[PDB]
């Protein structure tokens, strides 16, 4: 199994929706209701909305939107925004059957390599407090909890 990381493009659109869909249903099974999850996929992962985000990510050096490809098949992605020279990790999702093999770590490491060349010295993120899978992945990659906001924990890592 060979993993390549690169900028997403519009040909990745349909497979990106399926990855998201599968990851959300699996990751949030004990956490959000079925309906919440389907509304979220239908709204946040519509063709039109994602297309616009993919195109934005293409021309904007302060938006990193990368896919993980396992033998040429898209199986995960990561989204980060840089504003005032600080990073926000907005999104990181793999297909469930591709978790626990450091592909997520690889996506994070590619992002941080780009942050490093830009001079970003801080990255924040929101993770749901019951998402033990995500939350523990971040604490194992140097993120610390600084605050809570509703049902999320706010985490930060310094560079």
**Least gap, CB of 108 to ligand ACO (angstroms):** 8
Of the candidate residues 7, 42, 100, 116, the single one contacting ligand ACO (CB under 6 A): 100
- Per CB under 5 A, which region of 24-32, 73-81, 130-138, 147-155 contacts Br ion? 24-32
DSSP-derived secondary structure for 28-72: TTTTS-HHHHHHHHHHHT-HHHHHHHHHHHHH-TTEEEEEEEETT
- End-to-end Cα distance, the chain: 31
Please check whether residue 3 is in contact with residue 94, taking contact to mean a CB–CB distance below 8 angstroms. no
Measure the CA–CA gap between 153 and 128, rounded to whole angstroms: 6
Q: Which is nearer to its own copies, 63 or 70 (CB)?
A: 70
Please check whether residue 41 is in contact with residue 20, taking contact to mean a CB–CB distance below 8 angstroms. yes
Q: Is residue 32 part of the contact set for Br ion (CB under 5 A)?
A: yes
Of the candidate residues 102, 113, 129, 144, the single one contacting ligand ACO (CB under 6 A): 102
Q: Is 138 noted as a catalytic residue in this protein?
A: yes
Question: H or E stretch including 158?
Answer: strand 152-158
Is position 128 annotated in a ligand binding site? no
Query: Using CB distances below 5 to 8 A depending on partner kind, what does residue 127 bind out of ligand ACO, its own copies, Br ion, none?
Result: ligand ACO
Instruction: State the residue for tokens 């907005």.
Output: 90
Is position 117 annotated in a ligand binding site? no
**Least gap, CB of 102 to ligand ACO (angstroms):** 4
Q: Which is nearer to ligand ACO, 100 or 113 (CB)?
A: 100
């Amino acid at each position: 199994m060979s993993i390549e990381i690169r900028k997403l493009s519009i040909e990745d659109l349909e497979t990106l929706i399926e990855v998201a869909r599968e990851s959300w249903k699996w990751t949030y099974a004990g956490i959000y209701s079925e309906e919440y999850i389907e509304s979220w996929i239908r709204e946040k992962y519509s063709k039109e909305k994602l297309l616009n985000e993919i195109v934005r990510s293409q021309s904007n050096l302060d938006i990193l939107f990368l896919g993980a490809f396992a033998d040429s098949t898209l199986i995960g992605f990561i989204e980060l925004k840089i504003i005032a020279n600080k990073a926000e990790l907005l999104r990181l999702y793999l297909k469930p059957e591709y978790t626990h093999k450091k592909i997520g770590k690889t996506l994070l490491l590619e992002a941080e390599k780009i942050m490093k060349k830009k001079g970003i010295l801080e990255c924040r993120l929101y993770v749901h407090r019951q998402n033990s899978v995500g939350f523990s992945f971040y604490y194992k990659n140097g993120f610390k909890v600084e605050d809570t906001d509703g049902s999320d924990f706010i985490m930060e890592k310094k560079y």
